[PDB]
Amino acid sequence: TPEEKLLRAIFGEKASDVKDSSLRVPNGVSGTVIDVQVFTRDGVEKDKRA
């Protein structure tokens, strides 16, 4: 809506086109991470971690 146009024009926010869908700890839970496991599809390249 127009007011964000005005705001970005004032402050020059690029406003990139991508969301934040990360995994986070459920509220209240508090612990230690003991291991991590990664499963990749056959065609996809493997990351450094994997």
Binding site: T1, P2, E3, K5, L6, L7, A9, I10, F11, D42
Partner: protein, 431 residues
């Protein structure tokens, strides 16, 4: 005896059981009678000359290859045109329905029958008769009613319209009625003939259908679609070929059933070709699974189908069918999948309040700015007003100069960038 068997399948089978099969002789008998009816209607159509005129004119207007005569079309129709034209003169020669003119008409029809006509033109010709028949009947039912009820054998007053109808038609009413009723009789014979084969072969339809019934649409839908196919096949069958009827009919029945099961039976309608590809995929997977003794990886499957890997992957993901909103997800049949699904369209009361606050704050900050600067910024971004007016419109309204508006905006940005004024707007920083 009917035990109120409400099952529609039982009613269908009970109704179809009465008609008994007959083979190798009837099919020839009924086919002969169908062809006889069609020949009768074609002959009687050829009898009517104005239909021939109209068809020839329509041919001339428009302007299809390989006619079954027991620039090819134009040169073959040139002599037919000449014959028809020279036959018109003989009809004018000393006899309206003279035996010689009738013989010429007969030979013209004999030559004409040797050609092939597109069925749509044949229907057009039939309706060209139906329209005038209905017109003449409608304009005269009132005169017949009046002569029957009042005269019992005005008269000359009503005779004017009857004479006008003859003048418009330009032909004897009696022959028109003869040809029309002959149309009706021939068509009736043809129709009543085809019913017999159709009612005879319903069992064939049943067998072919039940071969496909394994959990598709439903039994009766398959049966009815097959019956459509059977009607088509009865239309297309020729005994002259000398083959058994079933051999021909089965292809049309399978085609109809399979085409319907492709079109319907899915909520999201996959086109036909994709259905064929998925069926190939499944037929290959079974055989390849039993050969290797396990499930085939998509790469090996792609190798066998001679298709690129991505295509196979796309088909695999497209294949799946939607899941019912009432599936019981809880072990106890109390909670259903439907209660578990969230609405996405709604916004949050938090964000609504935030938007309202933002609008108020922007209005407060803008009000503190210079009047012309404030109205310019409103006019440019469409703030508070229904639409945003472009640079040219603002220039022609306030001050023609284009670059002056650019300088106004530059100064407004400079002012609102001053840290004093912007303090509250920073709170809308993360967004």
């Amino acid at each position: 005896e009917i035990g109120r068997t409400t099952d529609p399948v039982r009613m269908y089978m009970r109704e179809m059981g009465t008609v008994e099969l007959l083979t190798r002789e009837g099919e020839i008998d009924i086919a002969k009678r169908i062809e006889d009816g069609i020949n009768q209607v074609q002959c009687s159509v050829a009898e009517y000359p104005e239909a021939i005129t109209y068809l020839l004119e329509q041919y001339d207007r428009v302007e299809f290859v390989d006619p079954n005569a027991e620039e090819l079309a134009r040169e073959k129709f040139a002599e037919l045109r000449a014959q028809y034209v020279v036959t018109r003169d003989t009809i004018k020669a000393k006899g309206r329905s003279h035996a010689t003119a009738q013989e010429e008409i007969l030979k013209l029809s004999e030559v004409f029958k040797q050609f092939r006509l597109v069925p749509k033109q044949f229907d057009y010709l039939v309706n060209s008769m139906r329209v005038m028949m209905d017109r003449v009947r409608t304009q005269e039912r009132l005169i017949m009613k009046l002569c029957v009820e009042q005269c019992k054998m005005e008269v000359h007053r009503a005779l004017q319209k009857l004479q006008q109808i003859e003048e418009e038609t330009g032909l004897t009413i009696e022959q028109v009625k003869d040809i029309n009723r002959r149309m009706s009789i021939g068509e009736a014979k043809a129709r009543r003939a085809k019913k017999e084969m159709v009612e005879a072969n319903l069992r064939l339809v049943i067998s072919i259908a039940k071969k496909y019934t394994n959990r598709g649409l439903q039994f009766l839908d398959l049966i009815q679609e097959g019956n459509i196919g059977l009607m088509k096949a009865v239309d297309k069958f020729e005994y002259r070929r000398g083959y058994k009827f079933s051999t021909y009919a089965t292809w049309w029945i399978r085609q109809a059933i399979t085409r319907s099961i492709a079109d319907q039976a899915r909520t999201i309608r996959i086109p036909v070709h994709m259905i064929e590809t998925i069926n190939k995929l499944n037929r290959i997977s079974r055989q390849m699974l039993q050969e290797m003794g396990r499930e085939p990886t998509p790469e090996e499957l792609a190798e066998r189908m001679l298709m690129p890997e991505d295509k196979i992957r796309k088909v695999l993901k497209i294949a799946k069918e939607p899941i019912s909103m009432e599936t019981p997800i809880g072990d106890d049949e109390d909670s259903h999948l439907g209660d578990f699904i969230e609405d996405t369209t709604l916004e949050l009361p938090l964000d609504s309040a935030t938007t309202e606050s933002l609008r108020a704050a922007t209005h407060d900050v803008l009000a503190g700015l210079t009047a012309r600067e404030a109205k310019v910024l409103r006019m440019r971004f469409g703030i508070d007003m229904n639409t945003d007016y472009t640079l040219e419109e603002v220039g022609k309204q306030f001050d023609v100069t284009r670059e002056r508006i650019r300088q106004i905006e530059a100064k407004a940005l400079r002012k609102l960038r001053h840290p004093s004024r912007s303090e509250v707007l920073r709170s809308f920083l993360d967004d």
